[PDB]
Design a protein around this ligand. Structure first.
Ligand SMILES: [Mg+2]
Ligand SMILES: [Mg+2]
Ligand SMILES: [Mg+2]
Ligand SMILES: [Mg+2]
Ligand SMILES: [Mg+2]
Ligand SMILES: [Mg+2]
Ligand SMILES: [Mg+2]
Ligand SMILES: [Zn+2]
Lengths: 184, 62, 129, 150, 81
RNA sequence: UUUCCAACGGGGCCUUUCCUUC
């Protein structure tokens, strides 16, 4: 059960965390067997406000159905068992290109495979069970763009500290800045 | 009883060609209903092996 | 029914500044509304505008200052052959010295000076001054 | 607004910004798709389904809970009626309109009203014809439509 | 008037406007869970009825329809969510 | 004339990226 859940040969952190799951695995019936069916493709490491680098886990995305059933209990043991670390769960999506003129016909394209829909599921994954209740985009008089992503209410505690990591996490993926806010 | 049948020979040739377009209508509605029904197997079979390998790469790693 | 939304914006713009307002709520916006307002805010005729997301087609709040006499929209998008840019500036713009006719070219939404340097032509969109 | 009279009146449903959730809603994709198919076997229209299910059960909307609109469900499960249900109530009305002109020919307003309704039917069909929900050559007519709806 | 914050409008004034005329529109109807102490479990109902709702088993009533929100019938309770 | 300097265009690269194909 060591490198099985890895779904790929490399590397080190992918092993450590893959080891970490199996240390959370044998707790017997409800703390395993619902955590075993899940898997992950890869892990990337990038910096955070808390000085604690971020650990971003990719998911094949049939599988975000069960991971979402766990999540909060899991990312509590992952940020504990692997600490000085911020642990988030992203889902690997396809991003098909917008065909050019000179390009020759490919199979059509769904809209959930589109670069913009994808980055709008990224922001949906980085945040979790709170919600996204609204958005805005300021175009600064410099010509810069900054996305105001507004969050919800209850349970929001869980990402409270995680705010400035998502902005960084998303800026290593995209090239666009993020900020958040809450009601009044 | 209206016109459009100039004699026996035409009336027959009409009937000749009317049963021929009622077969091309039957054969195409049997064969493309064989295309639909028999691709419903390739959906239940390919949805089975992700439900059969769903308990198989679960149980066998125990 | 709504026909050119680009014009339903630049109109709620030209009805804010005259009435003296510092901001306006325009709707639905667009890809092209954004890229108009972008060539505009770039030469300063407005400040920052903020895309709000309704779940349908959008709104914008545009914070505008004082400096904008008219920002217009050319309703049939006429085919401009790069001799005719000169004649489009000579008509609807207050002087040679400033002011901008904004068209569409294969090279994207831009002002007629960034057209004259890039050396591309296309369909006219509007103007701002 | 309102092609066929002068009323400009804005009324509609206001969709919630929430594309997931209630999250106070439990149930499942299995639960409603079975409630859907069990009503659509009872004779109910894809409008009265989301109508009954919204007030009697919890369903805000059946497209947030299940990934497909109440029509696409009835189709894939083979409950999709021959003609759209909008187009059906139209033809159903023109029948009850024309039935009333035959019994009283002295009502001209009716004769007017019948024109509006029919004007709508023929244009709706013309769309459904364009994207092929109806067979190219499908047309309305007063004789076959009385039978068609019944 | 002549300058204001449109992006950040007061919830006092925003609460009075029409449901299409809020900043991003949202519906003003709700849902609730109703009890008839004779029956031990609750049905979810929609604030605006139309169809006159009945509970799981017995045939009784819950609400009756009108133009606006459902009129609930006599002794009942409603939690909202 | 190169070096400095900014300016204005041109082209090509990497990031999930047909620019058809051996
Ligand atoms: Mg358009
Ligand atoms: Mg306007
Ligand atoms: Mg828009
Ligand atoms: Mg002003
Ligand atoms: Mg109207
Ligand atoms: Mg009209
Ligand atoms: Mg109404
Ligand atoms: Zn009851």
């Amino acid at each position: 059960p060591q490198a099985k859940i890895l779904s790929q040969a490399p590397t080190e952190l992918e092993l450590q965390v893959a080891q970490a799951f199996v240390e959370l695995e044998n707790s017997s019936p409800e703390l395993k067997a619902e955590l075993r069916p899940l898997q992950f493709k890869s892990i990337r490491e990038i910096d955070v406000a808390g000085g604690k680098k971020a650990l971003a886990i990719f998911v094949p995305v049939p599988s975000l159905a069960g991971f979402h059933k766990v999540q909060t209990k899991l990312t509590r043991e992952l940020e504990k068992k692997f600490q000085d670390r911020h642990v988030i769960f992203l889902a690997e999506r396809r991003i098909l290109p917008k065909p050019s003129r000179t390009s020759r016909q490919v199979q059509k394209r769904p809209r959930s495979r589109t670069l913009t829909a994808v980055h709008d599921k990224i922001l949906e994954d980085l945040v979790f069970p709170t919600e996204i209740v609204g958005k805005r985009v300021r175009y600064l008089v410099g010509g810069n763009k900054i996305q105001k992503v507004l969050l919800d209410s209850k349970d929001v505690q869980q990402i409270d500290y995680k705010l400035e990591s998502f902005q960084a996490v998303y800026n290593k993926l995209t090239g666009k800045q993020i900020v958040f806010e809450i009601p009044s | 009883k209206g016109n459009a049948f100039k004699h026996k020979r035409a009336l027959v040739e009409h009937i000749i060609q009317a049963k021929a377009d009622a077969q091309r209508e039957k054969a195409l509605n049997e064969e493309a209903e064989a295309r639909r029904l028999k691709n419903r197997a390739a959906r239940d079979r390919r949805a089975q092996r992700v439900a059969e390998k769903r308990d198989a790469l679960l149980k066998e790693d125990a | 029914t709504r026909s050119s939304v680009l014009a339903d914006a630049l109109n709620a713009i030209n009805n804010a500044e005259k009435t003296g307002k510092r901001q306006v709520l325009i709707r639905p916006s667009s890809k092209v509304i954004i890229k108009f307002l972008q060539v505009m805010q770039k030469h300063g005729y407005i400040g920052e505008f903020e895309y709000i997301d309704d779940h349908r087609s959008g709104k914008i709040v545009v914070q505008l200052n004082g400096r904008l006499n008219k920002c217009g929209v050319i309703s049939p998008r006429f085919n401009v052959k790069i001799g005719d840019i000169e004649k489009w500036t000579a008509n609807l713009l207050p002087a040679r010295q400033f002011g901008y006719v904004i068209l569409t070219t294969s090279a994207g939404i831009m002002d007629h000076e960034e057209a004259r340097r890039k050396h591309v032509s296309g369909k006219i969109l509007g103007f701002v001054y | 607004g309102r092609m066929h009279s002068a009323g400009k009146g804005i009324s509609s449903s206001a969709i919630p910004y929430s594309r997931n959730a209630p999250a106070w809603f439990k149930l499942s994709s299995e639960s409603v798709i079975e409630q859907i198919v069990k009503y659509a076997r009872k004779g109910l229209t894809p409008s009265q389904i989301g109508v009954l299910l919204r007030d009697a059960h919890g369903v805000t909307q059946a497209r947030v809970i299940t990934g497909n609109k109440i029509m696409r469900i009835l189709k894939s499960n083979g409950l999709a009626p021959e003609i759209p249900e909008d187009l059906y109530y139209l033809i159903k009305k023109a029948v009850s309109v024309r039935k009333h002109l035959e019994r009283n020919r002295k009502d001209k307003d009716a004769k007017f009203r019948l024109i509006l309704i029919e004007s709508r039917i023929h244009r709706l069909a013309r769309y459904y014809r364009t994207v092929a929900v109806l067979p190219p050559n499908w047309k309305y007519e007063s004789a076959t439509a009385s039978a068609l709806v019944n | 008037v002549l300058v204001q914050d449109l992006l950040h409008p007061t919830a006092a004034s925003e609460a009075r406007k029409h449901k299409l005329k809020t900043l991003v529109q949202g519906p003003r109807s709700y849902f609730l869970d109703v009890k008839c102490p004779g029956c031990l479990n609750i049905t979810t109902v929609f604030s605006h009825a139309q169809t006159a709702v009945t509970c799981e088993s017995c045939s009784t009533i819950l609400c009756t329809p009108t133009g606006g929100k459902a009129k609930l019938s006599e002794g009942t309770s409603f939690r909202r969510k």
